[model samples]
Target: VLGSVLAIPKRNQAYDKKKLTHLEEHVPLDENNITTAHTNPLPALTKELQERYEGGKIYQSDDKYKFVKAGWIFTGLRPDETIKTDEDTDQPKQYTKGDGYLYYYGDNPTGVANYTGHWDFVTDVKREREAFGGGSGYKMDSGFGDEVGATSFAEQVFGQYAPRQGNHRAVFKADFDAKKLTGTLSTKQKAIASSPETYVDRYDIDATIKGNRFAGSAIAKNTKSSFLEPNFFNKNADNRLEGGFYGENAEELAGKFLTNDNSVFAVFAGKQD
Candidate 1:
């Protein structure tokens, strides 16, 4: 029987090292420990190595943006400094503080198109309109180009385009008590006239001021608003309110008075006067 099976040529042959002698490594042919090209081994990644790898790679959430050369304005000028005469006109470059232009300070590692020397400077940061009426949006850099930072800053004209009536003005009074805020919003219609009508809408302002960051909300009577809306109030410096306000359908009377609806969302920031 043994001779018969041997003559028949064993159908299940073990690994033949002799047949693959050209390989760099030698493997002993065995039944249980048999190894083949199909076997693949991978090293386990260490926690430290995994973290390091992720840190160097860019993720989809990372901020990356670019700016057009012509639309950018240099904001590196300090209050005491001024630019030289314009090259074309030979006239001094002029910028008014109260003209309602906001300046942003950002860093560009990859450098910007018009200005490529230093990565740090200020600029108007041109905004491009979306093609399909998606609304206007600004592009920010991703540490490689012209990008906006996650910091807070105010330009004299930041809120220049906010809705304003020729004859209307609003006055707000804030009261802080025990880590809470309450305020009153009063409006004067036809403000410039001798007999301007006054409409007082009482509101409660709740916020916390940590350093320069001010976050809270203003709820008028039954009209609710965005709570803890991130804002910045520099009491020591500008003392201006910078944020946004939207009216929630609450008290019908208060909601109508607030009137910050779809077309008119209240933007908070401007000179009190």
Candidate 2:
């Protein structure tokens, strides 16, 4: 039930609200929504934002986010505005442009220890899912996230840890067993320094089926990875996912997630295959 554009930076310890802990790390989208890799810094709440929200009253101190702020930066910045461009360009400078309340339900919303809980930022925003009561079967859902450009959803969060590319194309097969659910989110990501074709960034989704929804812990992996092949074990468990079984026959399933270990977040939904 939130808008598209979510970020929940990981904390080493609780943090200060006005200032963020992960500002310097060139994560994908800055405050300005620049679509280039490693370019613009997250913008300060734009002047338009300030005028619209009126002194940061949109999300006050007591809101679920506890504390929040906004700002904008140049779409992309160079050493100087006098920089030139290729002859094909009309104007040298050019720039281009979450979901749900990527919610955090923990008690320490303002601390560094706090992490992302859920981000149902997929398309088709409104729907009350039905419970998982059908017989055991295989259902493959295919969909994409809103943040699948620039450095990609995976590269944005896991950096060298996850596979290359973003969470642009996600397809997972859901296993239904009464109130039990499990699946692998097969995300197509490009492998850096390899073939031009994309690779797979697999993250296992383990959630309990109940209340027409399911959520659980998981592991992250990559197909061509040499260092940490399938990384992120659940021993200290840091990731979380929540999804609903839609359609009268539960023909389709959709959900959102957060890779807490890497301070990364994204959303995905797919149909029954």
Candidate 3:
């Protein structure tokens, strides 16, 4: 059921290679989610997150199934330099970061498919400056992400992936670098990409990309569901899992990654050291 919902259209770029665009996401619906923290009929633990994570409650925190808001996915080096700080300074500089777009295409708002990538650099800033708004800017240092995640690979693999009980789990991790610019992605969620046609390799956003940001569309194949390794993620003491019972199926656990009763929670991109 998880697949690409939409893609940015390709542009004619043989003439002038433009710049990259900032990331922006369109709200799928505007009729506010009626089911919220204050009011609902579902169980306490499950109901809160279930409906919210399904793209219902935009601001609900208790809901574990929250969607990742659209933003820049920095990769490679660092920003050029800080306006107030000198480049030679040892301290980190705070220049603009890269902006990109994310397309949503999941069966449920809680769990399905989503794609993120560079923005299009074709929009005429001079003509539609205000229209683009805050998301119109984008930038990336040497900066995509590391070949390794903030955590170790083994930790992510053995700790959270491998299922211990009847409870189910799924996981995915990706590494990025600009110099060599290599990306390696793996998923314990066997069903996540069961079919070859449903699999996606890389995102190709056809548009003029220039300056700090731009406007355009991007597309990629949908993601498939697959078997998930229970212990693929990390279960560190600090992890502090969430606990409690659920509606009909009473899943027991402590923390965000382990508790099976719910979907739409964030997992470590890679395992811990």
Candidate 4:
């Protein structure tokens, strides 16, 4: 009776029978969901399987229900919750543990269920170099030298500001004592319109690195192009160098190449070679 055609709306009416059909299907489909409330969707691990896989066992089901290991439940310890650092107060915000289905890779066994440590991973270049006051040099000037060695500094700078798209990379060489910086900005393959990856062009960089500041200009070679605008960069408390290149033409101001116009932004970190 509920699915009767009389309930279907006529043309131009408030409702359409075709549209109402979805709601009817949803009602029967949701009937299975109500049964989920009566029975926990989380299936208890079978004793035989749990004993075979001491670390944990993955339970897969093609039915409407599925179960997987959540986290390590210590026999002696009470339930464990997690907290996150709040921005304003810098204090941790507590979160209560809740039950739900989950999945884990086969290799992982400690049952490290939460995404707590994912954000803490770092991938900058300033971590591996040794001569430029070590990895800690970018943080402060107390023990680490006030200046970074020319070669390592150049590499760090290149990595900091280079674009991620395409195969473009920057190479640097500098004289620490003379405070001279020179490098080339090149690409590997073509990515976007008229933009080839290899030798997108050569840039001859000449600059000075004084204290925490680097002032330089990247002049184009092998062609009639001009200097790399926004060539200078600054070192911040986070221990990184950053700069960019902008293009100007007949149309509008190109902000950064690969971004807008023909401009390109640059960044370098003082961690690795």
Candidate 5:
């Protein structure tokens, strides 16, 4: 009866199997999602892209998931830039964002539970570098994204989560000055039988960008899920979001989120307008 193919460790409370799996998911087996990319001159997206890319379909590092290969030109954040650590050699550190090294936990090869933050950018580069016996020809921008207007567009990618999903969608907007930033996040429920169809799980984003790293509040909308709203995150980092920018003109963004109770952790990475 789908009792659970997995053995859970602990939770803040005895949450329902269905409702708890809605937004926030806490699964140690769903941590590292290594989505690697490279800056080599990509083949092309038309027939040229197909011909050149197919000619070099050599980045298939994971036999279990060939789709995770570095074939497409990912115009977003590199996985390592997603989470930050403290300098005091701290333990049980904050899941913040820093330009530090990429960390991987457990057997994170298939990116099922473990991987590079933003996902496998390093190995991807090295893979292509090996193809020509040379380094990658290009690199992502090394600073914050360009200032964007409130009426800009954003495409998001959400994954590396557990309790699973039937698939989902989200809308993101960003209004940024040289430093200060604000945005909106609208999410619809996925595969939850609770909704007649689906409901919006909204959020207000208020953050500041320092260089390429940004961290701030994920204020849930009052119209959000009732039971999951109140205790979504802790008071210290209650409803928090953190991410970094990539691309030459700060044209992309990627980050993760955490709720205090069930640790509703997931990666949301995409482009910025």
Candidate 6:
């Protein structure tokens, strides 16, 4: 009888490495004995804070979001150091005073369906999340760019046609696969005869922000897919204008992106986004 050889797996075998490295090579740099802490940092907001803050003032709307209501307005433009109030009052009154500024300061908004919409300078960072249909918050850089911006991620999830600039100006899109329950993110250049590329992002269909105070169980897999769209072709399928634009005309793309035809599901308001 021939001798049989048994092979044993190495204790330090690498699962995902470029070269001849061990498993720990993929571990984060600060990951040693303290590794667990890195993956699960004690979140910024505590349980008590979550309960107190999230969704305190945020309200859901019955109608589709036509516009964000104007929030704080100046009751009156006062001369510097001329305005008088209790010692507790601050200039903006957001700080200092307990009540802060409430009523509209007399500089009444045009109220004429003006271009101005409610701008939230304040941000509520949360810990846990709830379940909803809108979208989840993700990290972005300090400023807007071709790929990410103040409105990019949520806009994409809403099935909006986004202007993407790569080697040139391209249009970005998101598609939901109802049968498979997965979504595909892609890009297509304006030029025809180009083969389109394809890719995906690890995003679940549902996640939520609970009352603007806390979020929960909304972790996403970091794995990313590339080459979703390259060299794609587009012919005038109909009179419908399907493409990307930017700057002053970005709102026009809303016509193509919104409406009931392509929506995966409607995301309810109040803590949506």
Instruction: Provide the clashing-pair count of each candidate structure.
Output: 6, 20, 62, 22, 19, 28
**Better structure of 5 and 6 per lDDT:** 5
TM-score of each: 0.22, 0.38, 0.20, 0.24, 0.35, 0.17
Best-fitting candidate, scored by lDDT: 2
Q: Which ten residues in a row have the lowest lDDT in candidate 6?
A: 1-10
TM-score of 5: 0.35
Judged by TM-score, which candidate is best? 2
Task: Identify the runs in model 5 with alpha carbons over 4 angstroms from their true place.
Answer: 1-167, 176-178, 189-199, 223-239
Rate residue 267 of model 6 by lDDT.
Answer: 11
Q: Write the per-residue lDDT of candidate 2 for residues 62-86, one digit (tens) a residue.
A: 1212222111111211112222234
lDDT of 3 by residue, 1-273 (tens): 111121111111111123343221211111122111222222342343444335322211122322221111212112232123343533323322222111221111211111222111111111112232111121111211111111111111222331111112222211211111111222222222342222223222222212211122222222222223112112111222211112122111111111121111222111111
Report the candidate with higher TM-score, 2 versus 6. 2
Better of 1 and 4 by TM-score: 4
> Lowest-scoring 10 consecutive residues by lDDT in candidate 5?
144-153
Cα deviation of 152 in candidate 1 (Å)? Answer: 25
The order of the candidates by lDDT, greatest first, is: 2, 5, 4, 1, 3, 6
Candidates by TM-score, descending order: 2, 5, 4, 1, 3, 6
Model 2 / residue 66 / CA error / Å: 34
lDDT by residue (tens digit), candidate 4, 4-28: 0000000000112344421111000
Q: RMSD to native for every prediction?
A: 30.7, 17.7, 21.7, 27.4, 20.2, 23.4
Better of 3 and 6 by lDDT: 3
lDDT of 5 by residue, 220-273 (tens): 565232222322222222535565555444455555443333223333444432
